[PDB]
């Protein structure tokens, strides 16, 4: 399946993901296209932050769903 | 009665004047 990740600027990127993929894998998929380290990025779905441990199937992410991407660089 | 931010979906606590996630401001 494919899902859509929506940045804060309003830009939308599409990702070829399988339900068995972990959130960790998703942030790596984002890293492939955007070039940002998976630890400086965080994903939001259903008003909650997604943890790298669980998979999409655990979070009920389905085909053509929308995730929100927020970036925060380490301030020390 | 958690409020959701305008710029990201994240629902925050009523006491928070700013979202914890994208550091946006409280909506009018
Ligand atoms: Zn926000």
Residue numbers in the entry:
A (entry chain A): 1 to 76
B (entry chain H): 6 to 33
Q: Can you quote the paper on this entry?
A:
To understand the underlying molecular basis for the K29/K33 specificity of TRABID NZF1, we crystallized the complex with K33-diUb and determined a structure to 3.4 Å resolution. High solvent content (67%, Matthews coefficient ∼ 3.8) led to high-contrast maps and allowed building of a complete model with good statistics. It was immediately apparent that the arrangement of Ub molecules in the crystal lattice generated seemingly infinite helical polymers. The asymmetric unit contains five Ub molecules and five NZF domains. A distal Ub interacts with the Ub helix of a proximal Ub, forming hydrogen bonds between Gln49 (distal Ub) and Gln31 (proximal Ub) and charged interactions between Arg42 and Arg72 (distal Ub) and Asp32 (proximal Ub). This exposes the hydrophobic Ile44 and Ile36 patches of each Ub molecule and enables binding of one NZF domain to each Ile44 patch along the filament. Consistent with other linkage-specific NZF domains, NZF1 of TRABID forms a bidentate interaction across the distal and proximal Ub moieties. TRABID NZF1 binds the distal Ub at the Ile44 patch via the canonical NZF interaction involving Thr14, Tyr15, and Met26. The proximal Ub is bound by TRABID NZF1 in an unusual way, at a binding site involving the start of the Ub α helix and two nearby loop regions. In this interaction, Ub Glu24 makes key interactions with a complementary pocket on NZF1 formed by Tyr15, Asn17, Trp18, and Thr25. In addition, the solvent-exposed TRABID NZF1 Trp18 side chain forms apolar contacts with the Asp52-Gly53 loop of the proximal Ub, and NZF1 Ser20 forms a hydrogen bond with the Gly53 carbonyl group.
During ubiquitination, the 76-amino acid protein ubiquitin (Ub) is attached via its C terminus to, most commonly, Lys residues on substrate proteins. Ub has seven internal Lys residues and an N-terminal amino group, all of which can be ubiquitinated, leading to the formation of polyUb chains. For the remaining four chain types, linked via K6, K27, K29, and K33, very little is known, and proteins generating and recognizing these chains in eukaryotic cells are still elusive. We found that the human HECT E3 ligases UBE3C and AREL1 assemble K48/K29- and K11/K33-linked Ub chains, respectively, and can be used in combination with DUBs to generate K29- and K33-linked chains for biochemical and structural analyses.
